[PDB]
């Protein structure tokens, strides 16, 4: 039973037909980055809600973040559904690092996954993602799709737990405005 | 002679101290071209790199002490005749990302100082390079990539004969490094924002110049098909509605020779231009003495009936916007003995008795 508002921030569409090979995409949960594996033609977008505006500019962070992962979602007969979603939390993209959390989803049509993780570092509890200092790193959400013809897209929604604190400013480049493809909104329709 | 070497006091892990001279450690120079413009970056490097090639009493202390509890003090020394002036800003940022914006809106945010060389002989501030702790080190600022920027906010009112140079004096002081941390309590006594409301320009003339700055400060600053944002501002945009006492820092960015009386008041977008009854609103008359360059404005709780939105839809017009605006109005007339426009910097320092309401789902654009 959801209460407080989650905000959408990262979406990624699997490659268009006839791409049917198993694929994957990595979400940088703090920097707001979407990196598809290899050269697969993923269609990715990042939105600009307050949460992302904070995550992308706050140098130091500390606290709990709640994440909702939504999986869409295509006109597929339930009986013929065979798409699976594997997701992993990681502290790096190095093979030597192990998964911090694993979830497996195999619901037909669409799916919803709620989970949370903590950001905590050495600076009196604060962490500065990917800084050389103390080898601090960000958090990655790796999503694997076994059937990109049934699975159309991933949606990451985020929420700051009241214990979330920030400090310091990062000089970011201008943030491009949002601005379709698949009819999942009245506006798109 | 031999002795108990392990009992020697060679483990002096205490901070940098002594006379102010003893606590100096580096000096840098900023070339101020006689022909520069607003938004013109003057200096842009890493804070750590300041120590390269330096030979001062605490240079080696600074670079070897593993923990410092004091603050970094920086003093700018420079001047120009009263017949001119300009606006320089020095700011410390925690880090950067590729092709970062150099617009003052994002630079100022964290920690900074602003002064006009045509009135101040020098200017200084202290800061904590570790925004969420009470201690720091040279190695920490080196690997955390702390950045420093000097930028020309406003160009010269009257160009100096030759290029001039501002000099920065870097030293350590015994002021305790208190942290500056933002959090989600709905009620906060002091929420610092350092938000660059904007650069106002009032050309010389006898016209009725009116400027509007929205108090719906969330969403960042506009640009082309993009926007600028910094942490303090995006943090307050987390709430849907808010209220509190507003504390603004107003800076005379043009020379003393350019003068104008400016009225400040809180009203709404329904208030039109050329309405010669602006003083019917409760307001403040701000005049600048030739020495004076900075004025604090205070808008207490009594200036607002209710809270107001942190964001508005960018398509919203003034005639359909019930959020309050800060008006800056030329009470008399902008003039002087020399050519040049009157630039007036407006920065929201922070909010006292901050009350945040609800939760903002967010709007992609700003204004």
Author numbering:
A (entry chain A): 6 to 184, 188 to 197
B (entry chain B): 1 to 367
Excerpt from the paper describing this PDB structure:
Cowpea mosaic virus (CPMV) is a plant-infecting member of the order Picornavirales, with a relatively simple, non-enveloped capsid that has been extensively studied. CPMV has an icosahedral capsid structure, which is ~30 nm in diameter and is formed from 60 copies each of a Large (L) and Small (S) coat protein. Crystallographic structures are available for three Comoviruses: CPMV, BPMV and red clover mottle virus. Together, the L and S subunits comprise three β-barrel domains (two from L, one from S) each of which contains a ‘jelly roll’ topology.
Until now there has been no individual structural analysis of CPMV-T and the RNA packaged into CPMV-M has not been visualised. Here we show high resolution cryo-EM structures of CPMV-M and CPMV-T to 3.9 Å and 4.2 Å respectively. The cryo-EM structures are of sufficient resolution to visualise the individual amino acid side chains and both structures reveal differences between the CPMV particles. The resolution of the map permits the side chains of the large amino acids to be visualised. The second major point of interest in the previous cryo-EM structures of CPMV, was the presence of additional density representing part of the 24 amino acid, C terminal extension to the S subunit in the eVLP structure. However, the eVLP retains the C terminal segment better than WT CPMV particles that contain RNA (CPMV-B/M), suggesting an allosteric effect of genomic RNA in accelerating polypeptide backbone cleavage.
